Design a protein around this ligand. Structure first.
Ligand code: HEC
Ligand code: HEC
Ligand code: HEC
Ligand code: HEC
Ligand code: HEC
Ligand code: ISW
Ligand code: ISW
Ligand code: ISW
Ligand SMILES: O=C1C=CC(=O)c2c(O)cccc21
Ligand SMILES: O=C1C=CC(=O)c2c(O)cccc21
Lengths: 503, 56, 503, 503, 56, 56
């Protein structure tokens, strides 16, 4: 049993929590993880796109094969010796990692704040004994290159052209079944009441599935551009995006900078909003006063942390920190998604709002916590209403066919995408007057400005939803949409008088 | 599928919770004739309840 | 007497410097501080807006009341115990704070660079005895929760439903009368010779007053959006915006990140400009080699600082560091304000220019310092002239009524705002063609781009006034204003020929 | 001989590597360095612009003269005594610098990682002995103010009104001949096979020459704005732009923040792209665990560095770290430059491509490194083709004369610039409809967005070439260009029917 | 001398056809027509590149 | 009292004419006409500024 895995995960896998062993639970997780019906593989549009060179690292279980050179066989020690000069830093980073110094975890005394790692080391060994990966009296010696890249606890030779693999999520889950089961639980915990989003999304467990199931990602010819989106959607495949290779430091993943590469940009400026907030600027001033090596449960007591981080706010749920970051999602970054705003007052959303207050009460009071969270919800609706008024203007022109070049020069999107109004495909593909300026401006007004507005509200950055981001740009988009609408109406009225003089 | 509700109506609904049907509150987004639009709570709550019955 | 308080403060309070006691000086400051005629209260437009939930913390002296729950009575020690799990970090942060360890300051020897805190500790105790807060032989034990949130040095029980208050500036000023008088001195030192800004503005002493006296802040219905502006304008009400609660670290307030949350954005990118400068990047590389705990007067010698920070440049005036940051303002961030540019050559500005050179000569030479400050002045005027030419074009259309939708779809702004051209309200409110695209583009050209140009000049970021910010966007705005002006001229000439064929 | 200087430098200087002495090699470098034919002086357009106050510090060898005050004479120690209160931080920063503590380098044991500075200390003395600045056995005691600002190792009086100079690059090269020759070698290594850029450019050795040889920099009247560009182009003149004065810390120059002030902005966001990458965020998280004082060659082993930095990636070439940062340049940031894209498949580029892979294979594998570098090349071309399609639309209008105000209000650029289509001058100068909105939009589409796209590809920031920068804004530029082009066609068709009714 | 100009769409089709037979057909990296990605024969793009290289 | 308005181009030409004779000619810091930087005689800009100083 894993005490940090919700009931919905075992129920979806048809397993009983009490008697299920780590070997039995791991096989059930990998079965759904590698099932093409549950998001694995090239996806439903796999016949429209082909992998590139870097894709064997982005989705190893689908595209990766060992390199044809060199054609040598190696043991455990041969990995360290030859790669000490082929990838010297990869060896030096692994030597510093906890994976190479496991005896340093067994000798940890009870007074050391890092004593919790011994319990995980014994749990890792406990998971492997159930799977038959080591002797009942044998202790795990090290976590070497051959363990992750070939097979866990391998004792014989391995062929560099046949047995080398890229460690995917299931490869990490062989030892860290707890963290792998917590992440996979996002498929079962993130279920929207009215189907606003696909089941299990948005989540790190289905970010790659969402990426390949995006129509524009498979339709567009710019594979190198589309693969940039893939680089931010590799949490489902590999687990080195927060604790990077090959140090795999837990203290690194707890820092806010680990989430910055992905959760930042024009449609979700979580890094920009948090850092400019008081919470983030305090994290930059007090990162030398905090002990990042202690776990998130002990970060506020034994770590001396007084400002919240990304891992502290999102991996927390009812006082426990797990790799599931979906059990408190309410707005899902995009307020314009149908059903999101209407669901904000439901008991489903109100329960997760109460779960956030518990996170905020770690420092603030419940009165202060609910006072600002009320501002985030009402402020998000105020921005949404600003876009809805501007979208009504552009949508009226689309239905009237009065958009620029809508009936003259508006080519169809690349297959298998069907033409539409204000679709996500128009953000990464454009040809002729498809999309139009008004069509793209109102799309970005919601996709970018309204989204960054809520992010500024959710991450207490006052400028993030007022002057710089959010209400500022939304005001400009509203003004320019109103201006072009009045211009085109006057231009249409002027053109109507020319046809009158010709008739 | 959930029934669509405009964001201005969601805001007027939140401002009318725990309020009498005859109470009047200011809209959080609408401005007409140089003044903020006043919304009677009896109308906004009625508009929400007719949308709740079309949901599932 | 407080030697760091100017004469204008005592003169405005009708007090004699020699005879004024700490009790009399505090009451005179609070009298003006809480006087609605001097900016306190909901302001002149308080009848147009109502507070929200978070407003009780943004303006406590006007809206805050204790919560109805819990209905418990507590002593001094009961504050720490019950909140150790209700607000655990607030208790754990306060214990780490100097406010909870006042005996730790008394054992500091004279050789320790932090000995000045003992003189302030005795000065704090000296001010409290003048107010009758404890006996002349009783020593101040600690600064606990009951001290700030109920009453200073309270010895009996306190009701959680009646006596709980949010510590405002006057609450902090009961003990720190020196820093409170220096901040309140901004009402008296910041007086513009030609009335370019209201008296005592811009300043941290009237930032909330300026916020509530902004017409759009009271007129707009999006209260959650407007209250975001309040979050950057709470220095007048509370004093935890630089040394945050509940650590209240002086070393934290000296760091540049403390000013980042407020002094950053599209209309005043001081954080972006300073950090990208050589001064800011040096502060990011050497923040581990500097002793931030030492005061600013000893920061360059005993603190090892070799690069300037926000507190070092702005809180310094004629060799002394005070909480008054207005005695060297000349441009006030917004170069387009009437009278600012024409006053830059006055003896008033030249005296403050010499005061800035005195700050620069601590590192650079006077020839080098004045060489770049002359570049800042001329560069700001060079940018200002760029906006003035573009503003003349859009303002020309406004008076002629030729703006898009000016006579057809231009609704009035929300009360109590009067309709105008390029007003600040049009940045946070828009409806129909009010404002127009050209009107908003030229408004942002001065409010945002021209302002960010001067900020880049004042904070040595070369790209901050050339390519990225300032001259770059101003060049684009000038081009697009000229392009639309020529287009609308061609459109008007074409429409005139249609009226000719119809007549 | 200097083993880190390429053969092309000695060949261009008519010197034999074996017999060339440190004095003889230095004199040959200064001859070309100060030759106006090789970029020194005011440049070819010096008759159109005049220096300002700060310009004497940007180009000292052309404009600087000692100040008329004070009229005092000083020895070596008199610089420290009088300036201890005139420039107190300058003295205190110099005291901690290695230049003032040379005996601290001699007493370093061989086991301390900073022993390499002793070899350079002896090499610095080795270069000075060849020039006859000190005895063959006399040791250099310190590097004081009189050494850099007057004459190296001066023992007699100096006039503050005649002998004071600004330490230029050649002044630093008198002692640091190795680093000065490596930087000057950029004139000889950076030679494009088809002349895509001028010989020796882009490089730190000719950044000031490129700055003053820009037509708009000399033609525009806003000298204070144009001098802002000079502040980013002073590597040719002085050598304190990475290791700043007066600490001159080598550890400071190795940090990524040293390149941020110049290599960041709308046309080359290298700082923004690197920091948001996984490489940069790791440098922000692990900068406290790394020993920045060790040299770049030992940074990955003796420094504990596990993430790449700007100095590590760009100063490395074939396993050696030199002040030449041009020997691996292929794209040169601006993909739209004629011949850059067509040369990416040549053996000249492929050789530098293998040199980049050698830098990455220090950590990643050759298969993984080449997998992403292929994405960088193809991803840059995908953006380049997007601009080429949009430029064909605006270029067609230019040849057709149908640009807005092209034939009515398009004044000539300031001398000596000739009017053209999409020229760099239109980025920093604009008047009337010169440039037009479409003309400026497509210019920035390549100059700003396409450049930032390649920077995001070269510095692994996925959002840097997809959503936020690059493909995102280029898509918007493509849409708005198509929108305005179709609009102007409809306006031309409408105007054509009006001319028909009048004829 | 100066190198002959080649459009970026042609460079990508040339790069996509490396280590491929001239009769192989690949998808363009930038061109889309009639709702489909334009297919480029590798023999034609290599011929188009070599005919520009011989003019240098 | 309120200060008389002065355009930024006039402020720059006045600063360039400080410590200069009225007959001296300096370059404008912002104006460009006929493809050349506009030259401003110092006697004219100082006269325009002095007429504004007396109106304050
Ligand atoms: C068995 C060979 C393992 C494999 C496969 C993976 N990990 Fe591991 N790891 C293992 C042990 C016994 C430990 C000791 C510490 C602990 O908490 O169990 C670790 C350590 C980590 C850590 C923490 C390191 C630290 O300094 O705190 C992390 C973050 C980690 N491991 C991540 C990780 C990933 C991403 C894996 C897939 C590539 C993975 N581990 C596989 C044992 C084993
Ligand atoms: C009397 C009960 C006080 C109240 C009310 C406030 N402060 Fe305080 N503070 C007090 C003392 C006796 C001291 C130590 C002496 C000193 O150096 O001031 C302090 C300390 C601080 C500090 C410095 C802490 C450090 O580690 O350097 C700061 C920044 C500070 N105090 C700020 C502050 C604020 C913002 C207050 C209002 C909430 C406030 N103080 C009230 C005593 C008392
Ligand atoms: C940002 C502009 C601030 C505001 C608002 C307040 N304080 Fe402050 N404070 C700030 C800085 C940058 C410093 C360092 C001064 C130095 O010389 O280093 C301080 C210092 C204090 C102190 C001194 C404590 C000590 O040095 O040990 C105190 C007691 C203090 N501040 C209190 C205080 C009060 C009462 C405020 C409201 C009137 C207040 N601060 C606001 C920055 C800022
Ligand atoms: C020395 C290099 C400084 C540093 C460090 C900081 N600031 Fe600055 N500031 C400086 C100058 C020379 C000026 C303009 C002077 C003038 O003539 O107006 C400014 C301007 C400001 C202002 C406006 C107030 C004013 O005096 O003009 C603000 C509000 C401001 N700067 C903010 C600010 C912040 C947030 C800083 C830390 C990131 C900061 N300054 C540092 C000089 C210097
Ligand atoms: C002879 C009088 C010199 C002049 C002229 C310059 N430098 Fe130097 N410097 C000199 C020596 C003998 C040393 C120590 C040996 C070494 O090479 O380290 C230095 C030190 C430096 C350093 C090292 C900083 C560190 O962290 O150790 C740097 C980065 C440096 N110096 C820079 C520098 C610059 C930019 C110069 C031109 C203005 C310059 N030096 C001139 C001797 C001499
Ligand atoms: C390129 C065209 C990209 C594709 C195909 C893609 N991303 Fe992303 N991304 C986020 C939101 C999404 C979604 C939406 C929800 C869902 O359907 O599951 C999809 C399909 C998708 N991306 C695929 C979010 C959510 C923000 C939040 O706070 O909730 C991210 C975080 C995220 C990473 C990302 C990056 C990394 C920087 C990039 C370049 C892209 N996406 C591009 C985009
Ligand atoms: C939202 C609509 C906001 C209001 C009503 C508001 N701010 Fe602010 N702000 C600065 C300049 C001002 C002024 C001008 C000076 C004065 O008249 O007294 C007013 C009335 C005002 N704001 C109210 C400055 C000064 C810039 C400088 O360098 O001098 C600030 C610093 C500042 C903080 C701020 C923030 C914080 C990020 C936000 C979101 C707003 N203001 C919005 C705006
Ligand atoms: C202001 C108008 C400026 C002038 C006259 C100027 N710069 Fe710069 N700059 C870079 C590219 C150039 C070039 C191109 C290459 C060459 O011709 O040698 C010129 C002539 C030039 N600038 C003069 C680059 C290269 C980007 C890359 O990654 O390759 C820089 C780095 C660079 C610094 C710079 C700054 C500093 C922030 C500024 C404000 C300017 N330049 C403005 C511009
Ligand atoms: O923020 C402001 C900057 C300039 C200005 O004139 C102004 C104003 O007039 C009223 C409210 C805010 C501002
Ligand atoms: O910055 C420049 C980038 C490309 C280019 O061609 C150029 C140029 O031709 C003249 C000045 C600056 C530039």
């Amino acid at each position: 049993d894993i005490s940090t895995v919700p009931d919905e995960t075992y129920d979806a896998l048809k397993l009983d929590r009490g008697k299920a062993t780590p070997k039995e639970t791991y096989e059930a997780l990998v079965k759904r993880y590698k099932d093409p019906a549950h998001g694995a593989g090239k996806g439903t549009m796999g016949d429209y796109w082909e992998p590139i060179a870097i894709s064997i690292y982005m989705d190893p279980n689908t595209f990766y094969k060992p390199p044809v050179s060199p054609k040598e066989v190696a043991e455990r020690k041969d990995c360290v010796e030859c790669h000490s000069d082929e990838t010297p830093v990869w060896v030096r980073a692994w030597k510093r990692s906890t994976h190479a110094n496991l005896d340093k975890i067994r000798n940890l005394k009870s007074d050391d704040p890092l004593y919790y790692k011994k319990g995980k080391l014994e749990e890792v060994e406990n998971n492997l004994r159930s799977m038959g990966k080591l002797g009942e009296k044998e202790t795990l010696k090290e976590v070497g290159c051959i363990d992750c890249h070939v097979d866990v606890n391998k004792k014989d030779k391995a062929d560099h052209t046949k047995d080398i693999r890229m460690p995917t999520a299931d490869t990490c889950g062989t030892c860290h079944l707890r963290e792998f089961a917590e992440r996979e639980s996002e498929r079962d915990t993130m279920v929207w009441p009215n189907g606003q989003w696909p089941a299990g999304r948005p989540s790190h467990a289905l970010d790659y599935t969402a990426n390949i199931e995006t129509t524009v990602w498979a339709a567009m010819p710019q594979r190198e551009v589309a693969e940039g989106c893939t680089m931010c959607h590799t949490n489902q495949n590999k687990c080195d995006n927060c604790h990077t290779r090959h140090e795999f430091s837990a203290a690194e993943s707890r820092k806010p900078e680990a989430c910055a590469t992905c959760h930042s940009g024009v449609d979700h400026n979580n890094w920009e909003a948090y850092t400019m907030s008081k919470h983030g600027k305090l994290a930059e001033m007090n990162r030398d006063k905090w002990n990042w090596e202690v776990r998130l449960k002990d970060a506020f007591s034994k770590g001396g942390q007084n400002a919240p981080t990304c891992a502290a706010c999102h991996m927390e749920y009812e006082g426990e920190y797990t790799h599931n970051i979906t059990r408190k999602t309410r707005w899902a970054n995009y307020p314009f998604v149908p059903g999101i705003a209407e669901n904000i007052t439901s008991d489903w959303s109100e329960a997760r709002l109460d779960s956030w207050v518990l996170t905020c009460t770690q420092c603030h009071s419940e009165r202060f916590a609910r006072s600002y969270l009320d501002l985030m919800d009402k402020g998000t609706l105020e921005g949404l209403a600003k876009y809805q008024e501007a979208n009504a203007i552009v949508h009226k022109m689309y239905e009237d066919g009065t958009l620029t070049g809508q009936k003259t020069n508006r080519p169809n999107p690349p297959e298998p995408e069907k033409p539409g109004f204000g679709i996500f495909t128009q953000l990464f593909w454009s040809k002729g007057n498809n999309p139009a300026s008004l069509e793209l401006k109102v799309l970005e007004m919601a996709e970018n400005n309204l989204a960054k507005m809520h992010v500024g509200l959710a991450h207490v950055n006052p400028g993030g939803w007022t002057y710089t981001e959010g209400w500022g740009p939304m005001n400009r988009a509203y003004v320019e949409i109103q201006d072009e609408y009045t211009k085109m109406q006057e231009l249409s009225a002027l053109q109507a008088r020319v046809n009158k003089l010709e008739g | 599928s959930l029934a669509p509700i405009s964001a201005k109506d969601m805001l007027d609904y939140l401002a009318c919770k725990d309020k009498k049907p005859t109470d009047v509150v200011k809209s959080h987004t609408e401005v007409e004739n140089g003044k903020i639009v006043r919304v009677k709570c009896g109308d906004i709550v009625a508009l929400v309840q007719k949308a709740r019955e079309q949901s599932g």
